[PDB]
Nucleic acid binder design. Structure first.
Length: 427
DNA sequence: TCTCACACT
DNA sequence: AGTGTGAG
C-alpha cells in the first residue's frame, strides 16, 4: 500500500505580505505594530494585513481600524493606494512578481495567491542528493527549521527546543539511502532555507514555509511555526499531528464540507477519520470527496503542483454597501467605466509582460437584498483592450436586470460590480 | 460596509 | 455557460 511519500512539496507564505511591502518602502514602520487598511473614511478603514507586533495586541484582519486602535493605541497604519475611486493593489502585485521570479530559479512553482506559492522540490532534491555523495547534513544548513513532533522522549526556551528537535531528527537520519522519504524531505528543507535566504537577500522580505510530501501537509506545516520559520512535517509525524488537529484546519475543510464531516460523522479531529471505510466516506460526501478524505486523514494527497506562475484571470471589482448602492443608470455606467479602465491598464501590462491576450469578459453584479457573493454572472467577447467598449459591453449584458420601469434609475440597487478577463490565449 | 481557483451541473 | 464553494 502506497504511503504518499513520492514527492517533496513546499508551501511558502510571505509573512503579512502587504505590511512587509509598506515596511520596506517606509523604514519608520519596520518592527512596529502596523497594519494595512483600505478606505480610511469608514471607521478608519478595513484592515487587510497585520504585522506580528500588532497581532500580539489582538489586531486581526477584517477589523475596522478604529476598533484595532482600541486594542493597540500606537498601531501604525498604511493605506492601500486608491485609483479611479477604488483600491489599487498594483504595488503588492508587483512585489509578488519579484518574489515569484526568485523562487522559480530554485524549482517549479504554483502561484496560489498574491503572497503564497507551492513549490515542487522533487527534482531539485534528487540532483542535490547526487552532489552529496554521502555526506551528513549539518544542523548548520537548517538554521530556521522545525521538525514537527520533535523533540520527544527522555530546555525552557523556544530556540533550544527547535535545535534539540533538529538534532534528534538529524541524529537518526539514514543518509546512505538516497530514496528514504525522510532524507528527501530533509534535503528539501535545505533547499527551502536557501530559497528563503535568497528571497530575503534580494527583496528584503521574510517568509515562512512548510515542507512535506503534498500540498495539504505543506500548507498545514507552514502555519505551525510563524513568522520567518519553516517546518518539516514527515509522513511519520502525521498520526500524532492529526490526533488533535481540528478538521477545519485542513485545506478545503474550513467551510461547509468540513462542517458536514464533523456533524455527520460525529468527530472533531482529522485522525478520527481513519475509522471509516472509503465506501463509508464516499456515501456521505460523494465519490471524489470520500476518496480524498480517506487518503488525506492518512497523510496522503496527490494534487499536483501545477507549473503556473501567472494568474489565470485578471479581475476588478468593488462593493457598494448600504446607502452607497448604485441606484441610477448613469451611476452604474460610470463605475463600469472605472473598473474597465483599471482592467485595461492591467490587461495591456499583461500582454506586454507575458505574451498572452484575454478573450472573454465576465460581468458579475449583486443586487441589494440578495444573500450571496454574486447575484448574476454573464459573459461576452473581449475583442479589444479598450475601456469604453468593455464598459459598454458589460452594461449591455446586464442592462436587463434593471426591474425599474424608468430609464433613468436602477432598481434594485447594485451592491457589487465585477469585471474579469478570462480565457487567455498565446499572443 | 478585493480578489483568485475549482468542481458541479 | 452560470452557480456555489474555499481561500488569501
Amino acid at each position: 500500500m502506497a504511503t504518499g511519500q513520492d514527492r517533496v512539496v513546499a508551501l511558502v507564505d510571505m509573512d503579512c505580505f502587504f505590511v512587509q511591502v509598506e515596511q520596506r518602502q517606509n523604514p519608520h514602520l519596520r518592527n512596529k505594530p502596523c497594519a494595512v487598511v483600505q478606505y480610511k473614511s469608514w471607521k478608519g478603514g478595513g484592515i487587510i494585513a497585520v504585522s506580528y507586533e500588532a497581532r500580539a495586541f489582538g489586531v486581526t484582519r477584517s477589523m475596522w481600524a478604529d476598533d484595532a486602535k482600541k486594542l493597540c493605541p500606537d498601531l501604525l497604519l498604511a493605506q492601500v493606494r486608491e485609483s479611479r475611486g477604488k483600491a489599487n493593489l498594483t504595488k503588492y502585485r508587483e512585489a509578488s512578481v519579484e518574489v515569484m521570479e526568485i523562487m522559480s530559479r530554485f524549482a517549479v512553482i504554483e502561484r496560489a495567491s498574491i503572497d503564497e506559492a507551492y513549490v515542487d522540490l522533487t527534482s531539485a532534491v534528487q540532483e542535490r542528493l547526487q552532489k552529496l555523495q554521502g555526506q551528513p547534513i549539518s544542523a548548520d544548513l537548517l538554521p530556521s527549521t522545525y521538525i514537527e513532533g520533535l523533540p520527544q522522549g527522555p530546555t525552557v526556551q523556544k530556540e533550544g527546543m527547535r535545535k534539540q528537535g533538529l538534532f534528534q531528527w538529524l541524529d537518526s537520519l539514514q543518509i546512505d539511502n538516497l530514496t528514504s522519504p525522510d532524507l528527501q524531505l530533509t534535503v528539501g528543507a535545505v533547499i527551502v532555507e536557501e530559497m528563503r535566504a535568497a528571497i530575503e537577500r534580494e527583496t528584503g522580505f521574510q517568509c515562512s514555509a512548510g515542507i512535506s510530501h503534498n500540498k495539504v501537509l505543506a500548507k498545514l506545516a507552514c502555519g505551525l511555526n510563524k513568522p520567518n520559520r519553516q517546518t518539516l512535517v514527515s509522513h511519520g509525524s502525521v498520526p500524532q499531528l492529526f490526533s488533535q488537529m481540528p478538521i477545519r484546519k485542513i485545506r478545503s475543510l474550513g467551510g461547509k464540507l468540513g462542517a458536514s464531516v464533523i456533524e455527520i460523522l460525529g468527530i472533531e479531529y482529522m485522525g478520527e477519520l481513519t475509522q471509516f471505510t472509503e465506501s463509508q466516506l464516499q456515501s456521505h460526501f460523494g465519490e471524489k470527496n470520500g476518496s480524498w478524505l480517506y487518503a488525506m486523514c492518512r497523510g496522503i494527497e496527490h494534487d499536483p503542483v501545477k507549473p503556473r506562475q501567472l494568474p489565470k484571470t485578471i479581475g476588478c471589482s468593488k462593493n457598494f454597501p448600504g446607502k452607497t448602492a448604485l441606484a441610477t443608470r448613469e451611476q452604474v455606467q460610470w463605475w463600469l467605466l472605472q473598473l474597465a479602465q483599471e482592467l485595461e491598464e492591467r490587461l495591456t501590462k499583461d500582454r506586454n509582460d507575458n505574451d498572452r491576450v484575454a478573450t472573454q469578459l465576465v460581468v458579475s453584479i449583486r443586487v441589494q437584498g440578495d444573500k450571496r457573493l454574486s447575484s448574476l454572472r454573464r459573459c461576452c467577447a473581449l475583442t479589444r483592450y479598450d475601456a469604453h467598449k468593455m464598459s459598454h459591453d458589460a452594461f449591455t449584458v446586464i442592462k436587463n436586470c434593471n426591474t425599474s420601469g424608468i430609464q433613468t434609475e436602477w432598481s434594485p440597487p447594485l451592491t457589487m460590480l465585477f469585471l474579469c478577463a478570462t480565457k487567455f490565449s498565446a499572443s
